[PDB]
Design an enzyme around this catalytic site. Structure first.
Site, PDB file in Angstrom:
ATOM      1  N   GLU A   1       0.807  -1.219   0.000  1.00  0.00           N
ATOM      2  CA  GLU A   1       0.000   0.000   0.000  1.00  0.00           C
ATOM      3  C   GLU A   1       0.846   1.277   0.000  1.00  0.00           C
ATOM      4  O   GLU A   1       0.611   2.181  -0.799  1.00  0.00           O
ATOM      5  CB  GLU A   1      -0.988   0.008   1.172  1.00  0.00           C
TER       6      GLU A   1
ATOM      7  N   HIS B   1       2.235   2.214  -3.290  1.00  0.00           N
ATOM      8  CA  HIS B   1       1.328   2.847  -4.248  1.00  0.00           C
ATOM      9  C   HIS B   1       1.504   4.361  -4.159  1.00  0.00           C
ATOM     10  O   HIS B   1       1.443   5.065  -5.147  1.00  0.00           O
ATOM     11  CB  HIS B   1      -0.137   2.466  -3.991  1.00  0.00           C
TER      12      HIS B   1
ATOM     13  N   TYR C   1      -3.597   3.700 -13.426  1.00  0.00           N
ATOM     14  CA  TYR C   1      -4.073   2.438 -12.876  1.00  0.00           C
ATOM     15  C   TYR C   1      -4.974   1.696 -13.856  1.00  0.00           C
ATOM     16  O   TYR C   1      -6.140   1.426 -13.576  1.00  0.00           O
ATOM     17  CB  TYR C   1      -4.800   2.673 -11.548  1.00  0.00           C
TER      18      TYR C   1
ATOM     19  N   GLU D   1       0.950  -2.237 -10.085  1.00  0.00           N
ATOM     20  CA  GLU D   1       0.698  -3.358  -9.167  1.00  0.00           C
ATOM     21  C   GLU D   1       1.950  -4.171  -8.872  1.00  0.00           C
ATOM     22  O   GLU D   1       2.225  -4.508  -7.729  1.00  0.00           O
ATOM     23  CB  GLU D   1      -0.385  -4.302  -9.712  1.00  0.00           C
TER      24      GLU D   1
HETATM   25  O1  LIG Z   1      -7.042  -1.837  -6.199  1.00  0.00           O
HETATM   26  C1  LIG Z   1      -6.545  -1.190  -5.252  1.00  0.00           C
HETATM   27  O2  LIG Z   1      -5.953  -0.086  -5.341  1.00  0.00           O
HETATM   28  C2  LIG Z   1      -6.657  -1.819  -3.862  1.00  0.00           C
HETATM   29  C3  LIG Z   1      -5.913  -3.154  -3.818  1.00  0.00           C
HETATM   30  N1  LIG Z   1      -6.040  -3.709  -2.462  1.00  0.00           N
HETATM   31  C4  LIG Z   1      -5.948  -5.015  -2.140  1.00  0.00           C
HETATM   32  O3  LIG Z   1      -5.776  -5.890  -2.995  1.00  0.00           O
HETATM   33  O4  LIG Z   1      -6.043  -5.347  -0.827  1.00  0.00           O
HETATM   34  C5  LIG Z   1      -5.579  -6.656  -0.418  1.00  0.00           C
HETATM   35  C6  LIG Z   1      -4.188  -6.856  -0.532  1.00  0.00           C
HETATM   36  C7  LIG Z   1      -3.291  -5.814  -0.765  1.00  0.00           C
HETATM   37  C8  LIG Z   1      -1.928  -6.066  -0.883  1.00  0.00           C
HETATM   38  C9  LIG Z   1      -1.438  -7.363  -0.766  1.00  0.00           C
HETATM   39  C10 LIG Z   1      -2.326  -8.408  -0.527  1.00  0.00           C
HETATM   40  C11 LIG Z   1      -3.693  -8.151  -0.411  1.00  0.00           C
HETATM   41  C12 LIG Z   1      -4.421  -2.887  -4.114  1.00  0.00           C
HETATM   42  O5  LIG Z   1      -3.770  -2.299  -3.224  1.00  0.00           O
HETATM   43  O6  LIG Z   1      -3.962  -3.242  -5.220  1.00  0.00           O
HETATM   44 ZN   LIG Z   2      -2.060  -2.707  -5.238  1.00  0.00          ZN
END
Ligand SMILES: O=C(O)C[C@H](NC(=O)OCc1ccccc1)C(=O)O
Ligand SMILES: [Zn+2]
Ligand SMILES: [Ca+2]
Ligand SMILES: [Ca+2]
Ligand SMILES: [Ca+2]
Ligand SMILES: [Ca+2]
Length: 316
Positions: free
Chosen positions: A143, A146, A157, A166
């Protein structure tokens, strides 16, 4: 808030004991003054209004089960800050020591974590798919990365730029997990995913296909789901990163590994100097080759391994 820096003790999501930096002013707050302009952790109280209230505690002891996700979010944000500072000479996500903010207990049964443009946000999970998401250091680091990406390359994105976005978060999430030496691996989210099931994870960098993500450019998702497969096609880049670090033979192409530290240096340079908001996989390859060239010379083993890895996943 204004107050006295001190140190409290608590227990994280996985039941481990840790010390956390707090601030004293009538209450003890989850505010760490030792890193940049501060790390601030907030209680969202099962609602979706953000950030919620700055986390206040009466005795500087955080052993309640309600406390756990806050403990880990606060602590792991700190570790992630240290990683970027100590390893890459970067001061917080914006390079100018911006305050880092997180809210935990977001919504109810929420199986997700995110960067909302301004702060990190963590659900508690539903107890089946996920336990509280800040319990995973690779999650927290994913996070915060990002935010780093948004302030540097600014990768859109969407489609290939989004998949790169990602993968960068998975790569650095993993490098931070190794930095803290907390049961490190090349898996993503294993500590907080499916508490009923051992040995699994949400994604794998060593073998993305284990969970149905592509490990070769020919296998990329070309549809519209997931913003054009940003969490799917990231597997291709994740596998390349894995190969650069660890080495191996993939679809008949052999790669000599150069290790985690150099992997991090190459990708950090690419991210901060050469990638742009609309970079695609092929431009990523170019950026990575150029970065390795900058750092190690055009005839280095490093440049060669970067080339072999992208060849192995079919990215020209
Ligand atoms: O789409 C977004 O921006 C939110 C998404 N969030 C997400 O997948 O949450 C669960 C998670 C995050 C990191 C590692 C394992 C599980 C992302 O950050 O990619
Ligand atoms: Zn992510
Ligand atoms: Ca307490
Ligand atoms: Ca691990
Ligand atoms: Ca992991
Ligand atoms: Ca599990």
């Amino acid at each position: 808030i204004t107050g006295t820096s001190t140190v409290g003790v608590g227990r994280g999501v996985l039941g481990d004991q840790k010390n956390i930096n707090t601030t004293y002013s009538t209450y003890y707050y989850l505010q760490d003054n030792t890193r940049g302009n501060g790390i601030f952790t907030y209680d969202a109280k099962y609602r979706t209004t953000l950030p919620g209230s700055l986390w206040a505690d009466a005795d500087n002891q955080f052993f309640a089960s309600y406390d756990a996700p806050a403990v880990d979010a606060h602590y792991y944000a700190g570790v992630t800050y240290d990683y970027y500072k100590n390893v890459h000479n970067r001061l917080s996500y914006d390079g100018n020591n911006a305050a880092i903010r997180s809210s935990v207990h977001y919504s109810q049964g929420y199986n997700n974590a995110f960067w909302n443009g301004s702060q990190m946000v963590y659900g508690d999970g539903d107890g089946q798919t996920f336990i509280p998401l800040s319990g995973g250091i690779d999650v927290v680091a994913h996070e915060l990365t990002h935010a780093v990406t948004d302030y540097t390359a600014g990768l859109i994105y969407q489609n290939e730029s989004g998949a790169i976005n990602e993968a960068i978060s998975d790569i650095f999430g993993t490098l931070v997990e190794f930095y803290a030496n907390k049961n490190p691996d090349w898996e993503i989210g294993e500590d907080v995913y499916t508490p009923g099931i051992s040995g699994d994870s949400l994604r794998s960098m060593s073998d993305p296909a284990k969970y149905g993500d592509p490990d070769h450019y020919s296998k990329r998702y070309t549809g519209t789901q997931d913003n054009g497969g940003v969490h799917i096609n990231s597997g291709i880049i994740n596998k390349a990163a894995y190969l650069i670090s660890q080495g191996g033979t993939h679809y008949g192409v052999s790669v000599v590994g150069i290790g985690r530290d150099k992997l991090g240096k190459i990708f950090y340079r690419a991210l901060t100097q050469y990638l742009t908001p609309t970079s695609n996989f092929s431009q990523l390859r170019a950026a990575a080759v150029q970065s390795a060239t900058d750092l190690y010379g055009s005839t280095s083993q490093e440049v060669a391994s970067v080339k072999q890895a992208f060849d192995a996943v079919g990215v020209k």
